[PDB]
Structure 1
Amino acid sequence: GVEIETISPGDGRTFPKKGQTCVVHYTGMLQNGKKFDSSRDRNKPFKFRIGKQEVIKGFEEGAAQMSLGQRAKLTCTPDVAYGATGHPGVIPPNATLIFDVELLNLE
């Protein structure tokens, strides 16, 4: 399961639903390791929709359990994202993922 630790401020009620394209200032982080991705660097904050399995499974449930302006803290299990395969060269097999997720979106 995805375990959420939201840094408090936001609105707490604009729940993400289907048919909604949302904007996340995410930041990838490997546990017991260094960074591997940061959306703030390119400054194109990754517009994507909900429900078409564009993102991985653990980020999808973590996106749904938030609201506008929040600052979550994901803890993705290996079996939802990459723990069987591992992304070649970037993500090792059987890995545990941490994300700094801020939802500053539309719709």
Structure 2
Amino acid sequence: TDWIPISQDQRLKKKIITAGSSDEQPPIGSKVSVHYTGTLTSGKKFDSSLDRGQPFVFTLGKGEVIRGWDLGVKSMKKGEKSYFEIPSDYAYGNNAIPGLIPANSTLMFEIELLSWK
């Protein structure tokens, strides 16, 4: 599978690992449920929703997650599992997460869109 650009500058992109069960996409304002695993561009894992044994839930389009996630999940179909490359300016930018993510880090995310309400 190939990288598919999500943004106009083609820097936010995804790889479809598993195609969705239908062509439904979540509307703005949906409470979306996902599985995810985050890694650095070295492959090292820094977090995964599986580590807490339940899906991760956030409201789409509200801006409570990093820009790459709002734009990325909005492009996904129900049931789709994709692999995202999120540049720093689509994530935490020049900020660092203590002990986990250095400043100006590209983030790799494996996201599976389970459902939404």
Name the counterpart of 1:51.
Answer: 61
Checking the alignment, whether the CA contact within 8 Å between 2:26 and 2:116 is kept in structure 1 is: no
Cα separation, 2, equivalents of 1:33 and 1:47: 24
Instruction: Give the aligned residue type for 2:92.
Output: Y
Aligned residues: 107
Name the counterpart of 1:36.
Answer: 46
Q: What are structure 1's unaligned runs of at least 5 residues?
A: none
Name the counterpart of 1:74.
Answer: 84
Q: Secondary structure of the residue that 1:90 maps to in structure 2?
A: coil
Cα separation, 2, equivalents of 1:106 and 1:57: 19
Pick the structure with more strand per residue.
2
Higher RCO (C-alpha 8 Å, min separation 6): 1
Checking the alignment, whether the CA contact within 8 Å between 2:78 and 2:113 is kept in structure 1 is: yes
Cα separation, 1, equivalents of 2:84 and 2:30: 21
Note the aligned Cα RMSD (angstroms). Answer: 1.4
Calculate the TM-score normalised by the size of structure 2. 0.83
- After superposing on structure 2, the runs of 4+ consecutive aligned residues of structure 1 that deviate more than 3 Å are none
What fraction of aligned residue pairs are identical, expressed as a percent?
43
1:3 aligns with 2:13: yes
Q: Secondary structure of the residue that 2:115 maps to in structure 1?
A: coil
Checking the alignment, whether the CA contact within 8 Å between 2:12 and 2:90 is kept in structure 1 is: no
What's the CA shift string for 1:41-85, capped at 9, x where partnerless? 211211111121111001111110101111111000111212311
